[PDB]
Amino acid sequence: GAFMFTSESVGEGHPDKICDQISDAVLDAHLKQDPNAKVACETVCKTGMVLLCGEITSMAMIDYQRVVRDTIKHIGYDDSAKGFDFKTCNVLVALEQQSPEDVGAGDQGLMFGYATDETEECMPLTIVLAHKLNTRMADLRRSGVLPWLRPDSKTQVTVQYVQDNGAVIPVRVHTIVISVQHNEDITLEAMREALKEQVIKAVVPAKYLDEDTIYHLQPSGRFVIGGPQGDAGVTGRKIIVDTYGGWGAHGGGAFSGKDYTKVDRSAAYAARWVAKSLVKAGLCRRVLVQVSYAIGVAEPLSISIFTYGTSKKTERELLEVVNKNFDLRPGVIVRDLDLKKPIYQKTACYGHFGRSEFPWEVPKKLVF
Amino acid sequence: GAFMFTSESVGEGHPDKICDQISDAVLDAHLKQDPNAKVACETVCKTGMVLLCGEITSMAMIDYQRVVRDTIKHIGYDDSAKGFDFKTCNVLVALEQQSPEDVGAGDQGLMFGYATDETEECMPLTIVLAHKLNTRMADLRRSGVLPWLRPDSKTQVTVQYVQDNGAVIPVRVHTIVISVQHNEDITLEAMREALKEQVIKAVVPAKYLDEDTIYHLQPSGRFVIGGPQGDAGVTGRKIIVDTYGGWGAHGGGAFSGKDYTKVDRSAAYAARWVAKSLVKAGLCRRVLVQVSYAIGVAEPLSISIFTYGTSKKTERELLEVVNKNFDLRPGVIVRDLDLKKPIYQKTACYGHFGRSEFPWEVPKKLVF
Amino acid sequence: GAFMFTSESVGEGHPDKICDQISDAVLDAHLKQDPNAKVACETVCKTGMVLLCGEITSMAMIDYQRVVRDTIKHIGYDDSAKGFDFKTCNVLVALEQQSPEDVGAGDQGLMFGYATDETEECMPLTIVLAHKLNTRMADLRRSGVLPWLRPDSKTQVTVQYVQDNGAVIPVRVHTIVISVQHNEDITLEAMREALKEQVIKAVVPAKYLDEDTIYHLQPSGRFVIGGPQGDAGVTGRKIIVDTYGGWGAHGGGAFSGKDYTKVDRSAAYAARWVAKSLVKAGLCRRVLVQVSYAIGVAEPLSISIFTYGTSKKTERELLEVVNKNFDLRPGVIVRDLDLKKPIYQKTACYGHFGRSEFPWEVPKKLVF
Amino acid sequence: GAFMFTSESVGEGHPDKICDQISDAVLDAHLKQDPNAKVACETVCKTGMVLLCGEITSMAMIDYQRVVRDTIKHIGYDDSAKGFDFKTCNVLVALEQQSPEDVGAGDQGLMFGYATDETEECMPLTIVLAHKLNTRMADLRRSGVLPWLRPDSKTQVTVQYVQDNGAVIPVRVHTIVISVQHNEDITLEAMREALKEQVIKAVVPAKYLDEDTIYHLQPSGRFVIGGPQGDAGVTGRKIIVDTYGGWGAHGGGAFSGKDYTKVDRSAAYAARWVAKSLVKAGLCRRVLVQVSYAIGVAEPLSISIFTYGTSKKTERELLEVVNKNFDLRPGVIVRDLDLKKPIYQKTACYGHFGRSEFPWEVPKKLVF
Numbered sequence A, B, C, D: 001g002a003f004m005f006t007s008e009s010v011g012e013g014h015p016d017k018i019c020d021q022i023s024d025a026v027l028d029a030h031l032k033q034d035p036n037a038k039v040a041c042e043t044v045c046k047t048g049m050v051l052l053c054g055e056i057t058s059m060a061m062i063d064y065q066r067v068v069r070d071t072i073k074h075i076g077y078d079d080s081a082k083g084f085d086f087k088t089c090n091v092l093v094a095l096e097q098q099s100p101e102d103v104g105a106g107d108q109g110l111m112f113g114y115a116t117d118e119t120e121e122c123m124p125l126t127i128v129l130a131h132k133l134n135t136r137m138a139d140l141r142r143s144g145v146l147p148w149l150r151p152d153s154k155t156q157v158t159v160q161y162v163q164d165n166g167a168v169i170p171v172r173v174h175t176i177v178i179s180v181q182h183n184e185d186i187t188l189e190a191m192r193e194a195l196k197e198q199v200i201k202a203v204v205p206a207k208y209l210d211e212d213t214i215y216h217l218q219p220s221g222r223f224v225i226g227g228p229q230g231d232a233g234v235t236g237r238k239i240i241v242d243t244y245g246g247w248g249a250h251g252g253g254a255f256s257g258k259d260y261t262k263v264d265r266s267a268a269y270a271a272r273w274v275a276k277s278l279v280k281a282g283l284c285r286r287v288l289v290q291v292s293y294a295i296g297v298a299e300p301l302s303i304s305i306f307t308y309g310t311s312k313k314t315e316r317e318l319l320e321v322v323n324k325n326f327d328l329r330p331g332v333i334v335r336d337l338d339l340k341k342p343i344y345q346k347t348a349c350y351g352h353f354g355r356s357e358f359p360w361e362v363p364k365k366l367v368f
């Protein structure tokens, strides 16, 4: 039942992603000394100018200058011409910091969860490739293989699909668009060649690459001193690339900068968890689990499982499976998913869903 | 086939929405003197501090101080204690301004369109009510009826649904959560009473209000000097409340601050247009139109119509209907939808879709 | 030998003075926990926006938000309309903080010292009155006597003089100009009356007030929401009001924000010390002591005493008196003057010289 | 009657001086299109971040981005590593601009004027050399002779004096301290050599250089990426280096950023004028003219001439000479000195007094 789809992703150098990372870096820095630290912060950046805003109630001694500059260094901004230098950039900290199982969900909410068997990660091929494409570039950057590669990058992958008496099977990569920051001493011809052979063909399964697959490598020509500027960088502005690449559903809640007590993060993770668990347990090939919460109430206020006719069990057979295998109460989620651990920074880029190294990405057994 | 859903919206005073409005106000200010002005700007705010960033190639004389302060005044920030005063706030302008039909779509893209017959607006009841709830509060604020009401507000509406051999039929409003900024001289008891009788019951159809409907009015107590701080307001961070309240699909593209040449805005509008037209023409009760574009190419690179079995025509009968009634090329879209007109500021709040006063909300005839 | 002179001073609310105080407040906050803390910071403010910049090598835990907001509170900025509210203003901290007798003067320098017997403080009448005028207003503000009085103020005092076979004897106050911020509910007539009877006549000695003395109270009319704005506030920009009101000599070195190791502060204090000691010891009626330092060298590189023919001893009789009573080496200065003590904030306003509560203002014995 | 003195100066790259220049550049930009433009602005900078603040009532179209960036370019900040790049730095403009002979002096004031015959410029040798030292470095920088030389620099000159039955006669340069920013590829040994032979010895008269003269060239080692940060540059914070190097007297009024209607600038210029005229006319070898003004009154409120016994005429013979040759009323000053002309930027560095290219530096005839 043919149709096509496109998804995108950005590198660690993208202005918005730098803020997402810095905000989560501050979250990590607090969890390490106080796993109960209440973090609610965000970052704004603009050409060698980083603004740390936020309200965080914790009891840990943190050097915000150090945590912000270290994060910028990690990303790869050490030289001047790159558009950012952790040693010289302005780090304005306007942060306010205080000191002092059946909890109850804060704020009426509705979290979504999604999973599909088109890839081993249980995530849309389009977004997975988009992320992996950026990931590979960072590797070649940090390894030395492609020393002209700079932190800021953008990726778009559009794959042609076809349904299957249930749902979504990828056929081939229609076109790929990738833009990456770079050093001056490197020709546009050499860049485009390296992007096709060393990054694209090294991550995209042969099955999907074609003789007609369209490539748009460095379309707008040069991207040298670009760096993290883009008029301004902000936290929580890359909501779709942090999730499913526009495939599931999204209520609009941002992750980065918020601790484990905010249902926007935790419950979203939990919802992905059960979704991934369901397909992994063969109970379906594609699911859209919807978990609703009521302010004050701990136990979820109605969970809905949405298979696209890919399950043999039947919605409200699968719901009982979820109700017998999962306890989606906020407090239980953080305990089961180990959400007090400082893993949030690595979650701040290349997507929150898909990577197996995260608790919520480890499928639960599911006793049926 | 019961399930519940929740959606949210924010008032004109919400930090993020102030930026969305200011950014669009600058867009309007340029279109009025140069309908071909290239606008790409964004705003950041934080307690009496507004930062205007951006790159805009236009040929019009604009007083940015005037357009920013006027927008803040319009929102209702004239006094000190409200958390913003257009006469005293810092307006830092770091704006860079230059001077000098079958076009061709910029940037690989994938826009979504959605519509459902559950309301006359052809939008999800949950998001419509959420928006209208905030709209009414602004009316009572500007009329004088509720003079304690202040600009910043947040709304959440969760409605219980049930499918119907096709899709989505609202049954009742399960719970409503509304928080609004206010003046000191007004009791929490009087506020909650006014919110239920004068705002909620004056906008929510009797059919949906129940004896069990849950109300959470000013849940966190007092919201007085809670003016635009919310730890830094930003542009394009309220992506879901600007669209379908998490019902359709969203690629992640922001509207506010971008002119009509960016497919992220125009094409998204066009997609809504055809979606609304389809259901209005009785061709379906619920649609998810998906329009894809290829960088460089003008004509859309594959459009997909997604009915949920609510159409009698059959996808790839409806596609021809769309291909015979619509010309979704970027240039044609702006011409047909009159996208060079300065209506963008009023689009910057209370949702981009739903309100009939916008070109894209006027259903096209559809000759079949 | 008639001539006239004018001097000025500003209140604790003056933008520049707020920065001078905040900068010194941060200095105090460090000295209390590490008397060897190396402080080099400055502040910038602009309508509810305070920027703390600086490089400080210390080993003490300080809450910059607390030290900045507390200083703003102390000044009297607690309400909105006053142009500053310590509870709501933006405190952007871009501060960088590290951790780890015959010293030797840093930076080639030339410090000046001045003293005259026209007042018991051994300071020019013009500047003393100018300071006292502002001081009294703060008292009436903090006591409650004049509750309409606000933090920002400016004072100018011009006195008619006459020489005396030596130097400078004040005759009468020619004119007084005073401007002070205020609340709305207070008439311009009532303000001007209170300024003349309760502030001016309560501080200016009867001997100097005349029937011709000119008064300019609130000349520019109203000064309500003025507050600390004045387009921006800065540290070290009120160099003359911090010293002698334009009577001695000034090399241009700023005090506030610099610790006791900077000769610009310490040596300047030391120079005032000896000047005050000389006149107090009857060795002269007016002196301008000039102390020069050489980078690297500890012992002062030539000290010059400048009496205006008011001494009977004779320059280079008085120099030996100074060389036999004083050891102006940097390290000795800080030890003798107890410069590691946190008294710098109270030094940040109403003048550094004159007030007896400071070590350098306590005359040394002088054995001759 | 031996004594020593020291004075300092800073290059066009010094943070404070960059602000002084930018502020005056904006003043020039307005005068060129509206000689009656009311300018009152100031600048703040900090590592690739320039903030333009101010209130200016004028009727001229100015591109503040252009005037700020052009000024930074002129100074020599075009590359990244230099600590500033006019093409990449953040120029935040928070400027507010409106549109619409016997005047009367604004604000009670007291301006000082000074001149001495120790140099042809009629300025203290110490400050003249200090300025010229920096000037030469800029020449070698802009010529190409010393291509490693960067914009930021600081200079200190201490000369040994001796009185003369009147006053001040320089004997020799005791020590010279000079620090200048530089490129990486240049040894500390080569820099110090070039500073002594090509800059110092090329500007300092042989008569003053000695075999004992102490040189401190690049004392603190390397000053590479020491670009404009110096923990925030500001306008009007270099008050003494803009005048007499601590030789005359200074009330504390800043020049840069203020138009010709502010007595702080105009009258100060006028006072220098008469001082220079007096010594040039042989009426004295050293003068300290003191001009006082009364708010509202046009004609100066008492002018005092202070010779140090270097005149044969006698104070109150010289006063009549001044009263018969000069009309120091504000309006007349601007007319006679051509103060509506855009020469203020070149006045913003290397000193306001001394250079003959300025109107006030051209001695008036003086008919006696």
Ligand SMILES: N[C@@H](C[C@H]1CO1)C(=O)O
Residues within 6 Å of the ligand: A153, A154, A179, A180, A220, A221, A222, A223, A226, A227, A230
């Ligand atoms: N910086 C932009 C592209 C550069 C080349 O203009 C980006 O995010 O891809």
Ligand SMILES: N[C@@H](C[C@H]1CO1)C(=O)O
Residues within 6 Å of the ligand: C153, C154, C179, C180, C220, C221, C222, C223, C226, C227, C230
């Ligand atoms: N704020 C100015 C005066 C006010 C009345 O215009 C001052 O520093 O005196």
Ligand SMILES: [K+]
Residues within 6 Å of the ligand: B041, B042, B235, B236, B254, B255, B256, B257, B258
């Ligand atoms: K945007």
Ligand SMILES: [K+]
Residues within 6 Å of the ligand: A236, A237, A238, A239, A252, A254, B236, B237, B238, B239, B240
């Ligand atoms: K968002």
Ligand SMILES: [K+]
Residues within 6 Å of the ligand: D041, D042, D235, D236, D254, D255, D256, D257, D258
């Ligand atoms: K100034």
Ligand SMILES: [K+]
Residues within 6 Å of the ligand: C236, C237, C238, C239, C252, C254, D236, D237, D238, D239, D240
């Ligand atoms: K100064």
Ligand SMILES: [Mg+2]
Residues within 6 Å of the ligand: A008, A010
């Ligand atoms: Mg993107």
Ligand SMILES: [Mg+2]
Residues within 6 Å of the ligand: A219, A220, B107, B295
């Ligand atoms: Mg492109």
Ligand SMILES: [Mg+2]
Residues within 6 Å of the ligand: A014, A015, A152, A226, A227, A228, A229, A230
């Ligand atoms: Mg970019």
Ligand SMILES: [Mg+2]
Residues within 6 Å of the ligand: C008, C010
């Ligand atoms: Mg002053």
Ligand SMILES: [Mg+2]
Residues within 6 Å of the ligand: C219, C220, D107, D295
């Ligand atoms: Mg006045």
Ligand SMILES: [Mg+2]
Residues within 6 Å of the ligand: C014, C015, C152, C226, C227, C228, C229, C230
């Ligand atoms: Mg003021």
